[PDB]
């Protein structure tokens, strides 16, 4: 019986692995993923269903969509009932560990054994972390606490490796999820990477000066008077929160400033990869001097996508291709196919199943993703689809990001910007709570996006408007509007946005 080890990297980005070949690559920012790569498969085409890390960590544990499982935004929390992956293994005989970012609200009391961050509500210190573990026995969670000096990503490495080497018993299988909080937001890289980059410029997007035929009303308003409202930026453009004030540059010059910032973005953010890339080389050392390479299924991949300052975006949440793809890689030393792609369309909601059928299990029938196991001995599985949906629905918060939802197909996305809060208490509060001055929480304008994603993989081209691509509007309209009721993601329970929603859909 397989082994395995689910590894997920907190707002770990594709155009931050050097295997997907983006501009970042030349950097080589990932050396020892690369090489997981070279000897597993990598997947092209794999896609969060919301793109921030409560909601997508919900959907992995449930393979479920969030208007199924209910984790809708971050403002939600799961259910210990729904830690359906972990239940699916232990009714398997599996012994169980969660390692690291937890993020979803409940104790992992599924879990035989947990070591997960508890600091700032969930997403932990990138120094000297405190962790909630099921040894802590004479506190109750979440009060059951120990605490770990050093670098963030170092501790989570050992915190597995320490499991592996005695706490396990070897007469059983493991399945280990192993989430590290880096590099998230905050880019708070270790000290030894100080001087990593610091002789290179970090390839610059043109996106990120030229945003002249993306977007729409709905992220732009009218004749773009919005533009200083919706979408937390790299440059000055966002009037509240941008990383030229947060870096305090101020050269003279706008354009040098956003630059700058666009440098230190950058490089603190790679930074921190590459100490995970690094402590990734640790683990697998381990691996392999302890004779588990070649008896356990790993996978990396990240909760969310992430916008490095493409189109002057940052954050993640919104559905254009930097956000919403997820780096998925999958090493299965039974798997002949080594160093192989696969375009096939997967979303997270397929990853329980998936893992479930590796191990010898039946893909459950009462999650909504499905399993393509199939792929790593060579077969496309039945009738999969070649399209995928996807729904942001956590309206302005934080980033200034409307709600949206979309499909995206292997030639074109459609995105409708739906500009509503299924809360409706939540109008007239700030999207920014620790800030005086935020902006509010007020519904935003309506409007369709439409990408060719296979000419224009850069989404610089909003085709919505265009006479030439009516019909190719009209079609796509008719796809997000089947596949929504497909999924029953039809908004009963929020007749606002049902309103809203149907009415734009024709
Ligand atoms: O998807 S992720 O990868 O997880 O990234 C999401 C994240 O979202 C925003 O940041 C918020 C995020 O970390 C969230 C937890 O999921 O927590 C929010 O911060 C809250 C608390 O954790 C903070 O401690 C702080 O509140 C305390 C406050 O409770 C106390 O009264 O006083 C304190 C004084 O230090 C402090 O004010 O802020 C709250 C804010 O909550 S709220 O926004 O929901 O109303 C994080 O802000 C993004 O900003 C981030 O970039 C990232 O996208
Ligand atoms: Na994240």
Request: aromatic share 12%; proline share 4%; with cysteine.
């Given at each position: 019986?397989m082994?395995?080890?689910?590894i997920?990297?907190?707002d770990?980005?594709?155009?931050?692995?050097?295997?997907?070949?983006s501009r970042?690559?030349v950097?080589?920012?990932?050396?020892?993923?690369?090489?997981?790569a070279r000897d597993?498969?990598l997947?092209?085409?794999?896609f969060?269903?919301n793109?921030?890390?409560?909601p997508?960590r919900?959907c992995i544990m449930?393979?479920?969509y969030?208007?199924?499982?209910?984790?809708?935004?971050?403002?939600?929390?799961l259910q210990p009932?729904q830690?359906?992956?972990?239940?699916?293994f232990?009714?398997?005989?599996?012994?169980t560990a969660?390692?690291?970012?937890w993020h979803?609200?409940?104790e992992?009391?599924?879990?035989?054994?947990?070591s997960?961050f508890?600091?700032?509500g969930?997403?932990?210190?990138?120094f000297?972390?405190?962790f909630?573990?099921?040894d802590?026995?004479?506190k109750?969670?979440?009060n059951?606490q120990?605490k770990?000096?050093?670098y963030?990503?170092?501790?989570?490495?050992?915190?597995?490796?320490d499991?592996?080497?005695?706490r396990?018993?070897?007469?059983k299988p493991?399945?280990?999820?192993?989430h590290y909080?880096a590099?998230?937001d905050?880019?708070?890289?270790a000290p030894?990477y100080?001087?990593?980059?610091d002789?290179?410029?970090?390839?610059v997007?043109?996106?990120?000066?030229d945003t002249?035929?993306?977007?729409s009303?709905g992220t732009?308003?009218?004749?773009?008077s919005l533009?200083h409202?919706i979408?937390?930026?790299?440059?000055?453009?966002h009037?509240?929160?941008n990383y030229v004030?947060?870096?305090?540059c101020?050269t003279?010059?706008?354009?040098?400033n956003?630059?700058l910032?666009?440098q230190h973005?950058?490089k603190?953010?790679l930074?921190?990869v590459?100490?995970?890339?690094?402590?990734?080389k640790?683990?697998?050392?381990?691996?392999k001097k302890?004779?588990?390479?070649?008896?356990?299924?790993?996978?990396?991949?990240?909760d969310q996508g992430m916008?490095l300052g493409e189109?002057?975006?940052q954050?993640k949440?919104?559905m254009?291709?930097?956000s919403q793809?997820?780096?998925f890689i999958?090493?299965?030393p039974?798997?002949p196919?080594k160093?192989?792609?696969?375009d096939?369309?997967i979303?997270?909601?397929?990853f329980?199943?998936?893992?479930i059928?590796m191990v010898?299990?039946?893909?459950?029938?009462y999650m909504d993703?499905?399993?393509?196991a199939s792929?790593?001995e060579?077969?496309?599985p039945?009738?999969?689809?070649?399209?995928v949906?996807?729904?942001?629905?956590?309206?302005?918060?934080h980033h200034?990001?409307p709600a949206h939802?979309?499909?995206?197909?292997?030639n074109?996305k459609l995105?409708?910007?739906?500009?509503?809060?299924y809360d409706?208490?939540?109008?007239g509060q700030?999207?920014?709570?620790?800030?005086?001055?935020?902006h509010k929480i007020?519904?935003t304008?309506v409007?369709?996006?439409?990408y060719?994603?296979?000419?224009?993989?850069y989404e610089?081209?909003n085709?919505?408007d265009n006479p030439?691509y009516?019909?190719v509007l009209?079609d796509?309209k008719?796809?997000?509007?089947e596949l929504?009721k497909?999924?029953?993601?039809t908004?009963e329970?929020?007749?606002?946005?049902?309103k809203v929603?149907?009415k734009?859909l024709?």
């Open positions: 019986q082994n395995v080890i689910y997920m990297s907190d770990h980005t594709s155009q931050a692995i050097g295997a997907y070949g970042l690559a950097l080589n920012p990932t050396p020892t993923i690369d090489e997981l597993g498969m997947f092209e085409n794999c969060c269903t793109s921030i890390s409560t997508s919900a449930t393979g479920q969030s208007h199924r499982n209910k984790v809708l935004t971050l403002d939600e929390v009932d830690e359906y992956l972990v239940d699916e232990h009714n398997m005989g599996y012994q969660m390692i690291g970012k979803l609200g409940c992992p009391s599924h879990f035989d054994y947990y997960v508890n600091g700032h969930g997403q932990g210190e990138y000297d972390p405190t909630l573990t099921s802590v026995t004479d109750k969670w979440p059951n120990i770990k000096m050093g963030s990503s170092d501790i989570v490495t050992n915190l597995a490796i499991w592996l080497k005695n396990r018993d070897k007469s493991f399945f280990m999820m192993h909080k590099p998230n905050m880019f708070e890289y030894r100080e001087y990593y980059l002789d290179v410029e970090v390839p997007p043109l996106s990120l000066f002249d035929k993306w977007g009303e732009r308003g009218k004749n773009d533009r409202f979408g937390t930026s790299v440059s000055s453009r009037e509240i929160r004030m947060e870096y305090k101020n003279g010059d706008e354009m040098e956003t630059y910032a666009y973005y950058l603190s953010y930074r921190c590459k100490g995970v890339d690094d402590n990734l640790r683990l697998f050392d381990y691996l302890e004779g588990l390479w070649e008896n356990t299924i790993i996978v990396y991949t990240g916008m189109h002057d975006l954050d949440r919104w254009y291709e930097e793809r997820m780096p999958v090493r299965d039974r798997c196919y160093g192989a792609k696969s096939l369309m979303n997270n909601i397929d329980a199943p998936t893992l059928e010898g299990g039946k893909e459950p029938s993703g499905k399993s393509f792929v790593f060579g077969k496309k039945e009738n999969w689809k070649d399209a949906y996807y729904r942001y629905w956590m309206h302005m918060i200034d990001v939802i979309g499909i995206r197909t292997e074109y995105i409708l910007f739906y500009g509503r809060h409706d208490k939540r109008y700030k999207s920014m709570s620790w800030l005086k001055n935020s007020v519904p304008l409007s369709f996006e439409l060719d994603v296979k000419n224009d993989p610089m081209v085709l919505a030439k009516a019909k009209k796509m008719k796809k997000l509007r929504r497909q999924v029953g993601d908004d329970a929020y007749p606002e946005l049902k929603i149907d734009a024709r």
